[PDB]
Amino acid sequence: MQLFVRAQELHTFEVTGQETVAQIKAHVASLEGIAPEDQVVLLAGAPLEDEATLGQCGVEALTTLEVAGRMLGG
């Protein structure tokens, strides 16, 4: 299950399907050296919930999710 995640740099990710949005954040956060707390994932613009999986979001492969800075934490 290979899909694209558009950060400041475009990256590609092979995901488990039961991959959470928090895991998507963690993957791209490790690449960019940033915090998964300092970002949110948008399915074609739609704000995906951290604890929800890609299956629960209803997103498949060959899709482009985008990372925006709308978060920090507390």
CB 23 within 8 A of CB 50: no
**Cα–Cα distance between 5 and 11 in angstroms, integer?**
6
State the method: NMR
- DSSP annotation of 57 reads H
C-beta separation of 30 from 22 below 8 A: no
Least Cα distance to 57 among 47, 67, 70 occurs for 47
Residue 5 vs residues 49, 64, 74: alpha-carbon distances, Å:
16, 6, 25
* Angle, CA of 72, 14 and 25, to the nearest 5°: 5
Domain count, the chain: 1
* HSE-CB of 38 using CA atoms within 13 angstroms: 8
The structure tokens 């613009």 sit at: 45
Place of tokens 């482009």: 64
CATH number for position 15:
3.10.20.90
**Runs of H (alpha helix) within 10-70:** 21-32, 54-57
In terms of residue numbers, what domain contains 22? 1-74
**Maximum Cα–Cα distance across the chain:** 34
